[PDB]
């Protein structure tokens, strides 16, 4: 089975300080018609480890994440919109990659992962000078009409961190003590969303890693260089989610809706 | 008062046989969100006159129009979409000019009006070879979702002929005997529409020619070369109608809605 999205679908637009507002205008326009938005992020993942007590492995997972979202800043964030069937405007960019202002010298990093990230294709000069200011960003994203609307559907893959950074950016405050509050915030800010990684897990588990590229390969998509970018990442997870939700009419093999695992994090 | 629409708004796309289907795809996409569509046409207007009886000046007007729509073919047809506030996609063309297949040698024309039309900017060579086939057109326009939907709002200026050609193209049959049936067809094919020329008439008549360019000038719009094209024409009447409907909240000076004259032709 070969799945070959229309060429314009594969176009990812770099956003910098310079073009932030225009792109956000476009976004603001498309969101009504294309109500599925998918998110990806890129950071050092240099994780500090919290020590002490907590509670089950989730309170530990949460605690670690919290600590890290707090101590770290995302270098890049991808976004992608499409309609529920995974259609995108035949005209103009439907996928953005926002590049935040990130100074290696001023932020947590190891020449190790600095060089690994340069190989990844991050240009730290551009990010230093031309980088988006996350305050501006958070502000545009607030009234854009993606957040806080049952109408919009958010799509994420292995979301703990990605949703962490996002909610952190929106809150403009230190992440909460506990998973519970963090979740009140997630559900407030994004009332409708799916973790593709969990839906896929569950699916693969009838007829029984889960890496997105596996889901992608089974779905038929070629491996285009573009998919490795952060933006590309959001693209891929959106194409994959939409295709998969079409095939199965968002029903699991057993006839219960994907909607059961709406709101459900991790994977 | 100066009214200066964003630059992208002023871009008109030429549609030929070659690009017909793609542009119609785009249109098909936008129609949901941009539900206001305006129409203009261009032909010889070399009217044949009917003689004999009829009924009041309207049965005569209709009869003449009928005869002409039947004997003539439109050279060009402009379309323009926007949202009810007159916003257009910041990306891609929101205004098309469809160039039909038109052979001067095979159709009704007078070297007089042939040369007048070449001055107008019609290139009859292109229209001869590359011109859209009106069967294909009518077909794309049918299922596009502009037609037969209360949702969409059609905008026209001095519509008798423009609506005549449009309805004639959709019907793929000889225009009806009488104004009454022609109107059944208009109302079926376009359940929501306005004649800007009549609304403007009515408006100017409190405080009491009506040429669109007057309405345009009073509205604040510069005279851009683009507005003289057929496409440009649809553009201008759409910008005008949206602006005007914003200012007055689609209410006449006396507080009755524009909606009173919905469905109402001529001017």
């Amino acid at each position: 089975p070969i799945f070959l999205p229309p060429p314009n679908y594969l176009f990812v637009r770099d956003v910098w300080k310079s073009n932030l507002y225009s792109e956000f205008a476009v976004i603001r326009q498309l969101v009504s018609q294309y109500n599925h938005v998918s998110i990806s992020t890129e950071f050092v993942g240099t994780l500090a480890r919290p020590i002490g007590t907590f509670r089950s492995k989730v309170d530990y997972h949460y605690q670690t994440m919290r600590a890290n979202v707090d101590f770290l800043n995302p270098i890049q964030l991808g976004l992608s919109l499409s309609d529920a069937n995974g259609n995108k405007p035949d005209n103009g960019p439907s996928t953005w990659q926002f590049n935040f202002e990130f100074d290696p010298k001023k932020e947590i990093m190891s020449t190790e992962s600095l060089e690994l990230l340069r190989k990844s294709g991050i240009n730290f000069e551009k990010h230093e000078n031309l980088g988006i200011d996350v305050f501006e960003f958070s502000q545009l994203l607030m009234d854009s009409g993606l957040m806080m609307d049952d109408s919009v559907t958010w799509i994420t893959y292995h979301a703990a961190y990605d949703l962490g950074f996002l909610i952190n950016i929106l809150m403009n405050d230190s992440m909460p003590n506990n998973k519970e509050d963090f979740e009140w915030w997630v559900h407030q800010y994004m009332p409708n969303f799916y973790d593709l990684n969990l839906v896929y897990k569950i699916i693969q588990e009838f007829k029984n890693q889960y890496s997105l590229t596996t889901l992608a390969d089974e779905l038929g998509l070629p491996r285009f260089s573009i998919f490795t970018t952060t933006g590309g990442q959001s693209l891929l997870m959106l194409l994959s989610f939409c295709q998969l939700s079409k095939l199965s009419m968002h029903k699991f093999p057993n006839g219960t809706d994907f909607a059961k695992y709406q709101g459900v994090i991790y994977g | 008062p100066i009214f200066l629409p964003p630059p992208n708004y002023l871009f008109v796309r030429d549609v030929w046989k070659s690009n017909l289907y793609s542009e119609f795809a785009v249109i098909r996409q936008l129609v949901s969100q941009y539900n206001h569509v305006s129409i203009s046409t261009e032909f010889v207007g070399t009217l044949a006159r009917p003689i004999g009886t009829f009924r009041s000046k309207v049965d005569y007007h209709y009869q003449t129009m009928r005869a002409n729509v039947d004997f003539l073919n439109p050279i060009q047809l402009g379309l323009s979409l926007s949202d009810a506030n007159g916003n257009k996609p910041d990306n891609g063309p929101s205004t098309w000019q469809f160039n039909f297949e038109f052979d001067p040698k095979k159709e009704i024309m007078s070297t007089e009006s042939l040369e007048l039309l070449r001055k107008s900017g019609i290139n009859f060579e292109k229209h001869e070879n590359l011109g859209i086939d009106v069967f294909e057109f009518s077909q794309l326009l049918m299922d596009s979702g502009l037609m037969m939907d209360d949702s969409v709002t059609w905008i026209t200026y001095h519509a008798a002929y423009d609506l005549g050609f449009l309805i004639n193209i959709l019907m793929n049959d000889s225009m009806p005997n009488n104004k009454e049936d022609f109107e059944w067809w208009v109302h079926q094919y376009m359940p929501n529409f306005y004649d800007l020329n009549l609304v403007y008439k009515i408006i100017q008549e409190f405080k009491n020619q009506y040429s669109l360019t007057t309405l345009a000038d009073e509205l604040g719009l510069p005279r851009f070369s683009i507005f003289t094209t057929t496409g440009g024409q649809s553009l201008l009447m759409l910008l005008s109608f949206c602006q005007l409907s914003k200012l007055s909240m689609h209410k006449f000076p006396n507080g009755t809605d524009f909606a009173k004259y919905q469905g109402v032709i001529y001017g």
């Binding site: - | 006159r49 009917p50 159709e107 007078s110």
Partner: protein, 210 residues
């Protein structure tokens, strides 16, 4: 230089056909037709005035045929289509789809052909081809039998296609002038219209069955 051409106008060559009541008629009406030129849809306008208060050489053909023979003793509605004088090289096939037309003025154009479809115009009564480029006329103009007045003045037209006088009711066939073959001319003078029509009715060549 086509007005002084004896092929087109045979009283240049006669000279006096002008004291033949038949050619007196012809050159007369033909003059009225020639006068009509330059205004688009003349007939329609003339009917504007006539309705109000205006030549209408259908009406002058009527006057003249009467004075010629007196001194020789919902919807259906509008029936006539005025395409006159828009110098037009071509004619829409759709006009023929209007079968209710009793009139149809095609005169004052560049038309070089008359479509065979003319035959679905069978309720036709006046027809005016004058001041066009027709080089010949449709047989199967013959199917048009209800024709009273028929004018192609000024074309280059050699012959009538037999068939009509398949058209019996024709009162006036204006021919002046195109380069007629002189056999029809010689009949048109001395037998007039009805006479010409009868030569045609009578002497049309045979035609077999399979």
């Amino acid at each position: 230089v086509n007005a002084s051409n004896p092929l087109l106008h045979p009283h240049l060559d006669d000279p006096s056909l002008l004291n033949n009541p038949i050619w007196k008629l012809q050159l007369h009406l033909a003059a009225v037709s020639a006068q009509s030129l330059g205004q688009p849809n003349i007939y329609a306008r003339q009917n504007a005035m006539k309705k109000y208060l205006c030549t209408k050489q259908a009406l002058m053909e009527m006057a003249d045929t009467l004075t010629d023979s007196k001194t020789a003793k919902d919807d259906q509605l509008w029936h006539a289509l005025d395409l006159s004088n828009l110098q037009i090289f071509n004619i829409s096939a759709n006009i023929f789809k209007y079968d209710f037309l009793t009139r149809l003025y095609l005169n004052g154009n560049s038309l070089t052909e008359l479509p065979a479809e003319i035959k679905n115009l069978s309720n036709l009564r006046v027809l005016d081809l004058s001041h066009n480029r027709l080089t010949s006329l449709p047989a199967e103009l013959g199917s048009c039998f209800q024709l009273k007045y028929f004018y192609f003045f000024d074309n280059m037209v050699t012959t009538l296609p037999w068939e009509f006088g398949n058209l019996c009711n024709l009162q006036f066939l204006g021919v002046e002038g195109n380069p007629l073959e002189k056999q029809f001319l010689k009949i048109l003078t001395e037998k007039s219209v009805t006479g010409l029509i009868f030569y045609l009715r009578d002497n049309r060549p045979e035609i077999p069955l399979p």
